Amino acid sequence: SMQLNQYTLKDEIGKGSYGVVKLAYNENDNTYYAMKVLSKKKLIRQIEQVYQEIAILKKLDHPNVVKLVEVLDDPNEDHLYMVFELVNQGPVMEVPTLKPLSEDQARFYFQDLIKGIEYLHYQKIIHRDIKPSNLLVGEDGHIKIADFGVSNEFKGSDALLSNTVGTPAFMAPESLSETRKIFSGKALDVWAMGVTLYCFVFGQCPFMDERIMCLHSKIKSQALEFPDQPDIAEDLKDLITRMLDKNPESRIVVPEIKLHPWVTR
Numbered sequence: 199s200m201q202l203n204q205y206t207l208k209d210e211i212g213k214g215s216y217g218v219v220k221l222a223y224n225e226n227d228n229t230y231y232a233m234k235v236l237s238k239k240k241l242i243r244q245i246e247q248v249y250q251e252i253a254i255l256k257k258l259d260h261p262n263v264v265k266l267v268e269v270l271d272d273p274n275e276d277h278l279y280m281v282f283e284l285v286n287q288g289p290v291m292e293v294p295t296l297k298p299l300s301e302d303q304a305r306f307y308f309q310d311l312i313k314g315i316e317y318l319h320y321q322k323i324i325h326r327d328i329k330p331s332n333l334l335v336g337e338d339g340h341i342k343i344a345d346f347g348v349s350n351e352f353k354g355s356d357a358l359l360s361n362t363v364g365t366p367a368f369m370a371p372e373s374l375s376e377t378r379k380i381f382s383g384k385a386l387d388v389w390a391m392g393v394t395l396y397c398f399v400f401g402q403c404p405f406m407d408e409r410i411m412c413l414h415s416k417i418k419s420q421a422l423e424f425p426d427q428p429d430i431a432e433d434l435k436d437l438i439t440r441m442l443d444k445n446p447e448s449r450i451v452v453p454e455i456k457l458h459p460w461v462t463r
């Protein structure tokens with residue numbers, strides 16, 4: 199267990215895009231943290247993606263958002279460390295899974311997600327990678343939105359984007375055009391919340407293919423189909439359908455989601 203300042207690094211708990219995430223025990227505090235360990239050699243070969251994320255994380259203080267506690271950036275060392283509050287239960291689920299959440303467990307987490315995304319949208323942040331593996335379950339049973347590695351900070355009431363980033367299964371149709379286009383960033387987040395809620399209760403994504411262009415094609419043009427098992431309520435089917443509206447103009451928005459009967463019952 200390598201020691202770095204006050205911390206003692208224990209097992210790897212996962213990997214992000216670059217580097218590793220390790221459980222870390224703090225000797226000053228007598229408590230555990232999650233430490234993202236990044237190699238600057240490896241980031242200098244392929245980030246400025248690291249320092250924007252850090253600038254975003256420093257602005258963010260909400261019980262449904264992961265908390266960045268400190269950055270250890272030595273100019274004359276290779277490693278850059280990023281220390282987060284540990285969210286001790288890990289992700290809300292693995293996808294695909296044969297054991298999806300119940301409708302009631304899904305609602306609980308979905309309410310937390312609304313609260314978190316609403317905060318993020320209020321702070322003028324589009325997450326751009328909302329999915330179950332980025333939603334970490336804490337001590338209290340609540341979720342914290344994690345991984346701001348591709349998020350975008352905007353000026354104005356919405357972000358107006360053209361670049362395609364994120365996880366393909368949760369990308370909205372308006373973002374998958376062959377020609378360059380411009381699309382609302384908030385509506386992207388909402389579509390991803392809908393694919394997320396679909397996963398919560400069915401344990402798989404609504405559109406899936408290993409082939410990227412077959413996936414894009416289904417996202418853009420395949421109608422939403424619900425399986426026979428599980429049998430989910432019609433109020434839930436309506437909310438998912440409204441979030442996975444392929445037209446970003448008519449797609450439901452976060453203020454409307456909050457007032458939806460599946461949410462408020």
Ligand SMILES: COc1cc(N2CCC(N(C)C)CC2)ccc1Nc1ncc(Cl)c(Nc2ccccc2P(C)(C)=O)n1
Pocket residue numbers: 211212213214219232264282283284285286287288289331332334344345
């Ligand atoms: C006991 O705590 C955790 C445990 C686990 N697992 C433990 C082994 C399981 N399997 C393989 C047996 C898989 C889940 C995952 C996360 C946390 N907690 C946690 N708290 C805070 C953070 Cl910032 C965090 N980051 C993290 C960890 C792994 C992967 C990716 C990120 P991000 C979303 C930042 O990119 N993780």
